Structure 1
């Protein structure tokens, strides 16, 4: 489909952000993962149809309770790894 690599910065850890991203990804039937980086940022790999991916990016910007998204970087690829499911990963 398309794969997005999304990096989120701001007040985005210890705020239920991974859970929020996972609920949005499952709602939008996207596959991939969300993971906290040790530098405070959140990485998101998401694969799916373009309408789902675009609307997902907008939802991510709204964040979880107490979060504040100050930046979102997105890079894209047509090469999907064929992920199923969306996981909170370590």
Structure 2
């Protein structure tokens, strides 16, 4: 059990993205949230096992989705909180 943070940028809000991401997590058994940042980015935080975070990291990059994902930056995270489901904002 471990949580990662990711900062996705590009055409990423308003294009079903925080939903798809949410949904895609829950499907991988993850918990977290996708939050809409003011710059235009989406900050996604998920927690599960590391290979389930890889799969999401992989989805976040190349996955089939409406959004035009220009970059995903993984960030180190020390939060070990039990998030409920996978929430938007």
Separation in structure 1 between the aligned mates of residue 79 and residue 17 of structure 2, nearest angstrom:
26
Separation in structure 1 between the aligned mates of residue 78 and residue 14 of structure 2, nearest angstrom:
32
Question: How far apart are residue 79 of structure 1 and its match?
Answer: 4.1
Give the TM-score normalised by structure 2: 0.89
Structure 1 residue ranges, 4+ long, deviating more than 2 angstroms after superposition: 76-79
Report 1:5-84 matches (<5 A).
Answer: 5-61=5-61, 62=63, 64-65=65-66, 67-77=67-77, 79-84=79-84
Q: Number of residue pairs matched?
A: 88
Unaligned runs of 5+ in 1: none
How large is the RMSD of aligned CA atoms in angstroms?
Answer: 1.4
Give the TM-score normalised by structure 1: 0.88
